[PDB]
């Protein structure tokens, strides 16, 4: 139930429950379950403690949760401190990957700010 | 005064000739230091001429003050109001180009289009001096968009520039100037 410092859902299938970890998607969830030798359709509640321990051991091989968050923060901070074009885009909160700003860009710019 | 002007112009002419000769000598002798010195002298002389030209451009009393620009539509009607809006945009763009700061004190927009009138404050160095010569009526000729037939129509708009003069300091009456009678 408690993996990588967080609680995973108990009533879901194992793959969906493992996706709740920050840094684990469907592909990594399948990889973890395959390396732990557990069927994906088995609910988390229907697992012995040793199986959960094996799941924790398998998850330990990936950079997840706070480690991943601080890695991402370090990368973004490095860009912003370098002051490259991507860093400036991150500073000003505009799309970083060359998307149009004349219209759209609402995900980066937040809700519309009337003049 | 005549000596200031005449000596300034004679020193300008003589210093230009001297700078030309020194530049010829520097370019011939490939002296980088003399070249840089001549460049500095030319820059100083250019600044001197620019300053004199500035005084000549703005001899007027209030040329250094900030100014107010009033734009009023005229004979064209709706076309005139659209033309007045165009003039307002033009003058705002020119002020931005010159670095002056503009604000809209007052404005009356035409119902169909454009503006009936607008009062704009322009603040900057010699703003009134730079803008005073734009006072007058501006005539516009084009195919009026407010004419179903698209006829070629003439429209008139007026720009008036006046300096911002500080309000007079009101002064209380000197008692020696008054005679008081009781009866």
């Amino acid at each position: 139930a408690r993996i990588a410092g967080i609680n995973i859902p108990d009533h879901k299938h194992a793959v969906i429950a493992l996706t709740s970890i920050y840094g684990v998607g469907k592909t990594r969830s399948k990889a973890i379950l395959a390396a732990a030798g557990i069927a994906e359709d088995v609910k988390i509640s229907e697992l012995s403690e040793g199986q959960i321990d094996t799941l924790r051991d398998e998850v330990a091989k990936f950079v997840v949760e706070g480690d991943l968050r601080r890695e991402i923060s370090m990368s973004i901070k490095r860009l912003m401190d370098l002051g490259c074009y991507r860093g400036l885009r991150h500073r000003r909160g505009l799309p970083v990957r060359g998307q149009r700003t004349k219209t759209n860009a609402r995900t980066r710019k937040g809700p519309r700010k009337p003049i | 005064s005549l000596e200031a002007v005449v000596d300034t112009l004679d020193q300008m002419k003589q210093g230009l000739e001297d700078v030309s000769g020194l530049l010829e000598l520097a370019v011939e002798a490939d002296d980088e230091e003399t070249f840089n010195e001549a460049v500095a002298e030319l820059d100083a002389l250019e600044e001197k001429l620019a300053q004199l030209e500035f005084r000549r451009m703005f001899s007027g009393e209030y040329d250094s003050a900030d100014c107010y620009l009033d734009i009023q539509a005229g004979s064209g009607g709706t076309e005139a109001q659209d033309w007045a809006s165009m003039l307002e945009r033009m003058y705002l763009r020119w002020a931005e180009s010159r670095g002056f700061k503009t604000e809209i004190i007052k404005e009356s927009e035409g119902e169909v289009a454009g503006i009936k009138s607008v009062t704009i404050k322009i603040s900057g160095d010699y703003a009134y001096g730079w803008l005073r010569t734009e006072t007058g009526v501006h005539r516009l000729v084009r195919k009026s968009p407010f004419d179903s037939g698209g006829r070629r129509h003439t429209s008139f708009s007026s720009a008036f520039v006046y300096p911002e003069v500080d309000d007079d300091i009101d002064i209380e009456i000197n008692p020696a100037d008054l005679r008081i009678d009781v009866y």
Binding site: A1, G5, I6, N7, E65, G66, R69 | -
Partner: protein, 177 residues
């Protein structure tokens, strides 16, 4: 009393050696541990205060005292004498048992725990820290959590300075960063 015996048998000796104390009575002691929940959002619903008090009672094994406003404050819309918090004071056996629980179970369960700050000493040797989610205590059942509660934990110590306080806490392998 495992940690109390560990104190009396190892921490006293280590601190005496480190600080060259003449008398054992000069060795710092862990006087008390105070857990406090500021439940200032209970003015709208006193029942939230009751649930927070239940959480604190479960965490500490002790019925909490309800603390009310010392004086009326308009900024937070509180009148004098209005119940806006709860607290527990742990001394002796209960204090040591809670200290062991906190060190060995609760602190490891802190989400993304990177180490407690060693600058959180009050200038006299007492150490205050904050807990953001009571779920770090296994007594709190995850399935029965109504609201994300937090608290603050103050270890009041007879130490005369921050150096002595941090030495005493480190002697218990307190996870300073």
């Amino acid at each position: 009393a495992k940690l109390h015996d560990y104190y009396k048998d190892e921490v006293v000796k280590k601190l005496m050696t480190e600080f060259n104390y003449n008398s054992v009575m000069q060795v710092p002691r862990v006087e008390k541990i105070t857990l406090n929940m500021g439940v200032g959002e209970a003015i709208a619903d006193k029942k939230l205060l009751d649930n927070a008090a239940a959480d604190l009672a479960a965490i500490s094994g002790q019925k909490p005292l309800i603390t009310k406003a010392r004086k009326s404050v308009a900024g937070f819309k509180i009148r004098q004498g209005y119940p806006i918090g709860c607290k527990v004071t742990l001394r002796g056996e209960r204090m040591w048992e809670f200290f062991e629980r906190l060190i060995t179970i609760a602190v490891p369960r802190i989400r993304d725990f990177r180490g407690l700050s060693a600058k959180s000493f009050d200038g006299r040797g007492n150490y205050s820290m904050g807990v953001r989610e009571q779920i770090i205590f296994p007594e709190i059942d995850y399935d029965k959590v109504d609201r994300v509660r937090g608290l603050d934990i103050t270890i009041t110590t007879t130490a005369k300075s921050d150096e002595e306080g941090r030495a005493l806490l480190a002697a218990f392998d307190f996870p300073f960063r």
